[PDB]
Design a protein around this ligand. Structure first.
Ligand SMILES: *[C@@H]1O[C@H](CO)[C@@H](O)[C@H](O)[C@H]1NC(C)=O
Ligand SMILES: *[C@@H]1O[C@H](CO)[C@@H](O)[C@H](O)[C@H]1NC(C)=O
Ligand SMILES: *[C@@H]1O[C@H](CO)[C@@H](O)[C@H](O)[C@H]1NC(C)=O
Ligand SMILES: *[C@@H]1O[C@H](CO)[C@@H](O)[C@H](O)[C@H]1NC(C)=O
Ligand SMILES: *[C@@H]1O[C@H](CO)[C@@H](O)[C@H](O)[C@H]1NC(C)=O
Ligand SMILES: *[C@@H]1O[C@H](CO)[C@@H](O)[C@H](O)[C@H]1NC(C)=O
Ligand SMILES: *[C@@H]1O[C@H](CO)[C@@H](O)[C@H](O)[C@H]1NC(C)=O
Ligand SMILES: *[C@@H]1O[C@H](CO)[C@@H](O)[C@H](O)[C@H]1NC(C)=O
Ligand SMILES: *[C@@H]1O[C@H](CO)[C@@H](O)[C@H](O)[C@H]1NC(C)=O
Ligand SMILES: *[C@@H]1O[C@H](CO)[C@@H](O)[C@H](O)[C@H]1NC(C)=O
Lengths: 234, 147, 317, 407, 49
């Protein structure tokens, strides 16, 4: 499918504070009123999703049906592929040199056959239930913004707060969602494991280098943004 | 041009030329601003010379404070000095005044001046010099009744 | 501050700045001349009178109403309701850039305006050409009507109508000034330009001007002084080129303000301190009198104009 | 100072700006966050047992700071040499990789662990690069790695086909072919085993006693920088402009208490004119406003050297509660003049309706008078008619032309 | 045009020009004020009626 992200896809551009002022910055932002891909009816193919300028991952997942994400170069043997797996009370962020299958599922613990991870990075567990995420890679820092806001994408405004930064530099051109269900299918090749569960939809929207003018209130929370190359008034 | 060789001393000469040109550009700009100011002042002085020396003007404080009569110019190495002759009233006195006078059922108004009074008497005088004159028909005109 | 704006808390930058020349003692010599000039423009229009006159206690001038232009003793700041309305509409130490306050505050200018109003109401035009002479206001109006060619009888007879029309105009001028919010545009434009010219200098200090960074504490800590001289030189050049144009624009704006103040003083002297025969110098039409009002950065002249109306066709020979 | 700034000797009567008043900072704080996930260097310096030379271990400690306090591990070091970096400046430099290698060798073999060395160890067991940038620490371990019966657990390579490359590791235990035939992989004549034992004993001499050696290899490559954090400093000094170095944000000013509630993940703060007005303390979560250090302009109000020399000092645009009659005005504050309560004619302007002059005695300060006072009697039946005339003259001087110049 | 007069059809020159400061938005702000002023001088003398 294809839908529109009207006024969503904004985040904090730098770790600086402001008080009821306006800040114009040329950053990598999501263009307002764009055409994002609403993959709600794809209940496990087509995992070929690029990572040129990043990804805007929006979801309304009911409760813990997502298991994590994977960002790799080509998903081949001896290729750096980061896997962020969110358990109940802890998340694991390791980069592996392994050949990943079409849809590595989690319900299993070992994704591929010959796994070989080398990093160590543990953090706080991450996982009307809107879960906004924005992923990017710049200056060798795999940078993520996360937000947990209640309610599809409404017409409101909510900034994305930088939560965790982690240093790594690779040619990240991979993206796929990891679902969770009841029926256990150990077969990696068979990409058909549809189970009767809640609504699942992984939003995909690519970022773009644009100039954004954000308005910082007295408390330092972005409450408005007008873009610069979409409407003449902007 | 004597301590360092020419091929490597080009940046020093370039910086010196830039500094000496930036110091002359601001001087030319300040000279232009001062010349515009001097031109405005000279236009004002020429207007004053034409409206005060070459005739009498009815303006209040354009040919001196007060009542302008005449103006004499004098040169100066970089300017002009205007001596304005002014007539100023002085030694004023209190008097009684009235708009008109009702006589024979008609309201008579003064032609020039105002009706002056100094106690059980009434005369006609101008608005700049006390000259008591009897109220006659030559200096007064009828404009209706006194109602 | 030529030393602090270009060189932030650095003694070596201060030693390097003196080699550029005498710009530091000229950019501050021109700006202080601008300030002394601005301290004189506010004395050629408001300080024209010598002795301060006051309003008599009896508030009966003959039928007219001047409560909106005379100072109000209730408000601690002695001003008129019109001046109070004008003061509530003009919307007004960070780095080596300070704002010097003017000599004549908003209270002394108000006193000068009240004195000029008393002189032009009670004495007429004699308070600006010599000793003040008392004269009734209806007779002053008859004088001003005869000065333009209209006989004094139309005013001595239809005095109540003229008084009511003047009172209605004075009452409606407040609503007219309150209707259009951009009426005091000429007084807000100068303030906005000054604020923009004062805020654009701090915004250009963050520019590297060719160097690696913008702050001196970073260049004097990452690179060694023997090899970091050209960076400080380029930074000083960039910060001096941004101040020279600022001083030039300030001089141009000061010349414009001086011309405007000379025009305003001429208008005050030829319209408030007497009646002028010029067509549109003291208002559009037949000028009778003018009342001044102060404002945080200017003067508002209220010109009383006599306009004919209800004309009729006739035969002439 | 007035004569200096005016470049003259007989200053006239008036007010003149000479210099600017700037308060100098007294102290200078650093405050960067608490010292937290400390690396484990004692895990390699205080290990129960080290590894052999032929199988020297290599540990990588990462995102773990770099506190170089190796002195506490048997301070009497036998060999503490640094290559490419000086001893103590080491503690305040960042690097990408801090690889740490360890092994045990004899006391007389420590010289082989250095750039450009020849022998058995340097060539066959452990080779360091020529441009090695790091440190080499060696200490005696007789008590630990020696037994009365001989500690034969430490082995070392004695024969090899060729010299090892820098930082090369070879566990091969194949029979070194010293003769002409391959020997079919059996130990015999002209076919010796490459590894040999040490057999450290407590009765050995200092030259043969065991020596635990550890190398600190420092790499700095294209990647992030996550080590080297032994950074620490002073306490907060409130109400007094000091030099602050908060988490890299350097400046000079007063750090005052705030009431603006920031975001939890927000630390810095800037105004509309790109000026730092608030920073969060790294140690304790608390926001402090950076107010500019007190500054203004000093000005001499001199009556002129013709009359006297007593002058007055005016600080413009600054309240002088902090750093001769002190009086606070609306345009600043002046010292050296007395506030007289009778209004006279203004002679030397100051600002906000205050003027100074010489009473004749000392400099005075008074509110300027706008003129005399005269209230005319306004009556509807009274007028003032003049009687006499006066013929006066008014002088008006106006410039016309300028000096024609050319360059 | 502050961008085209200084930097002819070069994106790197445009990226380098923004580091100089806000001169590009001031030189064009003064010239447009000059133009709006010139659009007013022709209305105080001819548009009096
Ligand atoms: C969005 O994409 C779909 C499919 O490509 C297309 O039909 C639709 O017109 C697009 N809408 C917009 C907002 O351009
Ligand atoms: C995964 O979640 C289960 C249930 O809370 C928990 O017992 C287990 O320790 C978790 N494992 C980790 C540490 O990821
Ligand atoms: C006229 O009388 C009034 C009231 O006594 C007085 O104030 C005024 O000075 C007198 N004027 C002259 C010129 O005598
Ligand atoms: C006023 O002056 C006139 C002319 O001298 C004189 O006739 C008249 O008697 C005087 N009146 C009084 C009462 O002073
Ligand atoms: C004059 O006008 C004001 C405002 O309308 C009013 O309050 C006052 O009573 C009027 N006074 C007279 C003399 O009518
Ligand atoms: C006078 O008469 C002419 C011709 O009928 C007419 O156009 C004009 O409006 C009239 N003016 C007045 C004042 O009545
Ligand atoms: C530093 O330690 C103090 C005292 O234990 C604690 O209150 C604070 O949260 C710590 N701050 C950081 C940045 O770890
Ligand atoms: C000094 O004062 C004397 C006496 O008043 C005066 O004659 C002279 O012009 C003054 N000189 C200066 C330099 O002010
Ligand atoms: C200036 O000093 C006074 C006297 O201590 C004090 O109230 C305050 O610091 C300042 N006053 C104001 C309101 O600026
Ligand atoms: C002037 O006198 C007034 C009234 O007594 C008083 O309040 C004020 O402080 C005095 N100013 C000085 C100290 O000259």
């Amino acid at each position: 499918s294809y839908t529109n992200s009207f006024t969503r896809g904004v985040y904090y551009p730098d770790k600086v504070f402001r008080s009821s002022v306006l800040h114009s910055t040329q950053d990598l932002f999501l263009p307002f009123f764009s055409n994002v891909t609403w993959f709600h009816a794809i209940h496990v193919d087509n995992p070929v999703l690029p990572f040129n300028d990043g990804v805007y991952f929006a979801s309304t997942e009911k409760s813990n049906i997502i298991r994590g994400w994977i960002f790799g170069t080509t998903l081949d043997s001896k290729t750096q592929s980061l896997l962020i797996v969110n358990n109940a009370t802890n998340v694991v962020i390791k980069v592996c040199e392994f050949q990943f299958c079409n849809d590595p599922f989690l319900d299993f613990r070992v994704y591929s056959s010959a796994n070989n991870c080398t990093f160590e990075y543990v953090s706080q567990p991450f996982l009307k239930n809107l879960r906004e995420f924005v992923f990017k890679n710049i200056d060798g820092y795999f940078k993520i913004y996360s937000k947990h806001t209640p309610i599809d994408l409404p017409q409101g405004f909510s900034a994305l707060e930088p939560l965790v930064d982690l240093p790594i530099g690779i040619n990240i051109t991979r993206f796929q969602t990891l679902l969770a269900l009841h029926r256990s299918y150990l077969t990696p090749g068979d990409s058909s494991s549809g189970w009767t569960a809640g609504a699942a939809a992984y939003y995909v929207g690519y970022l773009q280098p644009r100039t954004f003018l954000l308005k910082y209130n007295e408390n330092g929370t972005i409450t408005d943004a007008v873009d610069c190359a979409l409407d003449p008034l902007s | 041009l004597s301590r360092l060789d020419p091929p490597e001393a080009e940046v020093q000469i370039d910086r010196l030329i830039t500094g000496r040109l930036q110091s002359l550009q601001t001087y030319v700009t300040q000279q232009l601003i001062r010349a515009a100011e001097i031109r405005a002042s000279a236009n004002l002085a020429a207007t004053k010379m034409s409206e005060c020396v070459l005739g009498q003007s009815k303006r209040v404080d354009f040919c001196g404070k007060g009542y302008h009569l005449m103006s004499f110019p004098q040169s100066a190495p970089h300017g002009v000095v205007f001596l304005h002759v002014t007539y100023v009233p002085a030694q004023e006195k209190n008097f009684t005044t009235a708009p008109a006078i009702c006589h024979d059922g008609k309201a008579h108004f003064p032609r020039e001046g105002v009706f002056v009074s100094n106690g059980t008497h009434w005369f006609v005088t101008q608005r700049n010099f006390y000259e008591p004159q009897i109220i006659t028909t030559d200096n007064t005109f009828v404009s209706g009744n006194c109602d | 501050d030529c030393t602090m704006y270009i060189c932030g808390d650095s003694t070596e930058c201060s030693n390097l700045l003196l080699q550029y020349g005498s710009f530091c003692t000229q950019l501050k010599r021109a700006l202080t001349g601008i300030a002394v000039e601005q301290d004189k423009n506010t004395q050629e229009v408001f300080a024209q009178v010598k002795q301060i006159y006051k309003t008599p206690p009896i508030k009966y001038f003959g039928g007219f109403n001047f409560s909106q232009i005379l100072p109000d003793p209730s408000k601690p700041s002695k001003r008129s309701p019109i001046e109070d309305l004008l003061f509530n509409k003009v919307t007004l130490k960070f780095n080596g850039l300070t704002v010097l306050p003017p000599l004549l505050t908003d209270e002394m200018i108000a006193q000068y305006t009240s004195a000029l109003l008393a002189g032009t109401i009670t004495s007429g035009w004699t308070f600006g050409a010599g000793p003040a002479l008392q004269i009734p206001f209806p007779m002053q109006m008859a004088y001003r009507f005869n000065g333009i060619g209209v006989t004094q009888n139309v005013l001595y007879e239809n005095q109540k109508l003229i008084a009511n029309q003047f009172n209605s105009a004075i009452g409606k001028i407040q609503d007219s000034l309150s209707s259009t919010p951009s009426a005091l545009g000429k007084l807000q434009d100068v303030v906005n330009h000054n604020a923009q010219a004062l805020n654009t200098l701090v915004k250009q200090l963050s520019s590297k001007f060719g160097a690696i960074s913008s702050v001196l504490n970073d260049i004097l800590s990452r690179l060694d002084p023997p090899e970091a001289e050209v960076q400080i030189d380029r930074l000083i050049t960039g910060r001096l080129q941004s101040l020279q144009t600022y001083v030039t624009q300030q001089l141009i704006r000061a010349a414009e303000i001086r011309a405007s103040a000379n025009l305003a003083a001429t208008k005050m002297s030829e319209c408030v301190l007497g009646q002028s025969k010029r067509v549109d110098f003291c208002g559009k039409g037949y000028h009778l009198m003018s009342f001044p009002q102060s404002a945080p950065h200017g003067v508002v002249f209220l010109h009383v104009t006599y306009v004919p109306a209800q004309e009729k066709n006739f035969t002439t020979a | 100072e007035t004569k200096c700034t005016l470049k003259s000797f007989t200053v006239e009567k008036g007010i003149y700006q000479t210099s600017n008043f700037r308060v100098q900072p007294t102290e200078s704080i650093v405050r960067f966050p608490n010292i937290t996930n400390l690396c484990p260097f004692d895990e390699v310096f205080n290990a129960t047992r080290f590894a052999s030379v032929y199988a020297w271990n290599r540990k990588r400690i990462s995102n773990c700071v770099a506190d170089y306090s190796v002195l506490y591990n048997f301070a009497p070091f036998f060999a503490f040499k640094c290559y490419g970096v000086s001893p103590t400046k080491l503690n305040d430099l960042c690097f990408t990789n801090v690889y740490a290698d360890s092994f045990v060798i004899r006391g007389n073999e420590v010289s082989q662990i250095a750039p450009g060395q020849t022998g058995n160890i340097a060539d066959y067991n452990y080779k360091l690069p020529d441009d090695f940038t790091g440190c080499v620490i060696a200490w005696n371990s007789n008590k630990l790695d020696s037994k009365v019966g001989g500690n034969y657990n430490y082995l070392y390579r004695l024969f090899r086909k060729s010299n090892l490359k820098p930082f090369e590791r070879d566990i091969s235990t194949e029979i070194y072919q010293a003769g002409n035939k391959p020997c079919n992989g059996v130990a015999g004549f002209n076919c010796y085993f490459p590894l040999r034992s040490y057999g450290f004993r407590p009765t050995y001499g200092v030259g043969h006693q065991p020596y635990r050696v550890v190398v600190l290899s420092f790499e700095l490559l294209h990647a992030p920088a996550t080590v080297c954090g032994p950074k620490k400093s002073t306490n907060l000094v409130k109400n007094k402009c000091v030099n602050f170095n908060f988490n890299g944000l350097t400046g000079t000013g007063v750090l005052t208490e705030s009431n603006k509630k920031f975001l939890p993940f927000q630390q810095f703060g800037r105004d509309i004119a790109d000026t730092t007005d608030a920073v969060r303390d790294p140690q304790t979560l608390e926001i402090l406003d950076i107010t500019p250090c007190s500054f203004g302009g000093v000005s001499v109000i001199t009556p002129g050297t013709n009359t006297s020399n007593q002058v007055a000092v005016l600080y413009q645009g600054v309240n002088c509660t902090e750093v001769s009659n002190v009086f606070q005005t609306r345009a600043g504050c002046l010292i050296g003049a007395e506030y007289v309560n009778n209004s006279y004619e203004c002679d030397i302007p100051i600002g906000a309706g205050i003027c100074a002059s010489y009473q004749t005695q000392s400099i005075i300060a008074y509110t300027m008078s706008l003129g005399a006072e005269n209230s005319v009697a306004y009556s509807n039946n009274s007028i003032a008619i003049p009687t006499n005339f006066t013929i006066s003259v008014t002088t008006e001087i106006l410039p016309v032309s300028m000096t024609k110049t050319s360059v």
